[PDB]
Subunit: 124 residues, 3 copies
């Protein structure tokens, strides 16, 4: 009845992360899919919210043992109608997930007190 | 053998939370059951400890997909003889939990460096 | 198909933790096994990294309901070739783990923004 394959936690300082995006124009497009960079309404997603998604991808990597060769764009945080964040993995991340037998992904995000936090659990 | 239904994490800045309780007298009684507002000895529970319980309820909500209509007073953090915090859900929260098939609740709390953190896992 | 026995989260302020180690020479050897105090290369492990391991041990204790009589040196954070942190429990911690039926340990560590965080899940 055992099913947890890995867990990850990650914490990002929002202000630092925002500074990093502003300094290198190409960075946001390297870390995020077009869909993640937008709010449901169509406006550009804000720094704290992006920092939480960055934290989610770091946490996901940790859950998988963070091997080399994983692409940021092969993990996607998407959002249920109800508002709940979800992980979708493709390509390199999905391949690594399959090596370990991961069937289900669980994520939660928080951004408060200028830190963005994420927890991720991989189950299979 | 899969059993995780949801996870939640939440982080509350203690000082801000304390300020919010002081500003609106009715707030503490809206967020907490009489039992949560007391220490085992019978003295009033402190701000950092209440902030961690607030974080626990936010995390629990996230674990359930945070639908509308949940009452703060339908989630209760109680404490084992040994000191371990526990979640008890009733009414609206329990009903939502039943929709998703949640049988067991796991929580942990931390308050240090002026932030209160909670993680919650719903299993079934 | 239920298997989660406990979860723990803990957050340590790095600067405070470093101050505590410096103030009392004996503290590091009370909290850590010789192996934890070193980096893979053989150099002394740094404060933030030790703070995350301290957080891991606090989180592990929480996952077990933090009974009296557990030794810090009966929990060991070790490191896979790939870099992933792992928990190994012996003696008092393993005995408590056996009382609860714990078979598997899951940990993740983070140190950023001057806080070290750990999450631990005990499964069985
Ligand atoms: C290893 C990595 C995850 C660390 O995360 P970070 O945000 O840079 O640093 P954090 O302080 O949050 O985490 C550091 C801790 O992660 C842990 N870690 C290191 N390597 C790891 C690995 N292979 N697997 C899981 N955890 C690992 C360690 O415990 C480390 O602390 P320690 O050295 O003191 O023990 C990061 O450097 C990395 O390689 N990220 C890859 C991201 C990626 O692949 N993304 C694309 C796909 S989504
Ligand atoms: C949605 C909610 C949980 C967010 O928590 P918060 O403390 O206000 O804000 P945080 O920064 O900690 O969390 C925000 C993140 O939560 C996530 N979130 C939003 N809606 C969610 C939902 N329906 N389910 C799970 N997670 C959700 C998102 O990832 C969001 O970040 P993002 O917008 O950048 O993606 C909160 O606004 C809420 O509706 N709480 C309800 C509490 C409740 O029902 N209590 C009574 C019963 S205990
Ligand atoms: C109880 C203990 C874990 C608290 O951790 P801490 O870092 O001092 O304090 P934190 O703020 O991070 O956590 C406090 C929260 O832990 C929770 N906690 C207290 N007793 C607990 C127990 N028996 N089991 C699980 N959680 C407990 C409570 O929710 C508490 O907050 P609250 O009083 O406001 O409800 C700690 O005091 C302790 O006894 N550590 C033992 C460590 C140990 O045995 N190590 C050796 C083996 S690795
Ligand atoms: K299971
Ligand atoms: Mg990090
Ligand atoms: Mg919050
Ligand atoms: Mg602590």
């Amino acid at each position: 009845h055992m099913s947890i394959i890995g867990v990850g936690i990650d914490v990002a300082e929002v202000e630092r992360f925002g500074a990093a995006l502003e300094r290198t124009p190409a960075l946001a497009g390297r870390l995020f899919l077009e869909s993640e960079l937008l709010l449901p309404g169509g406006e550009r997603r804000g720094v704290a919210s992006l920092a939480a998604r960055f934290a989610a991808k770091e946490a996901l990597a940790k859950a998988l043992g963070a091997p080399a060769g994983l692409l940021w764009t092969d993990a996607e945080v998407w959002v249920e109608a109800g508002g709940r964040p979800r992980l979708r993995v493709t390509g390199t991340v999905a391949a690594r997930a399959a090596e370990l037998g991961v069937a289900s992904w669980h994520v939660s995000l928080s951004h408060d007190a200028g830190i963005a936090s994420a927890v991720v659990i991989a189950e299979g």
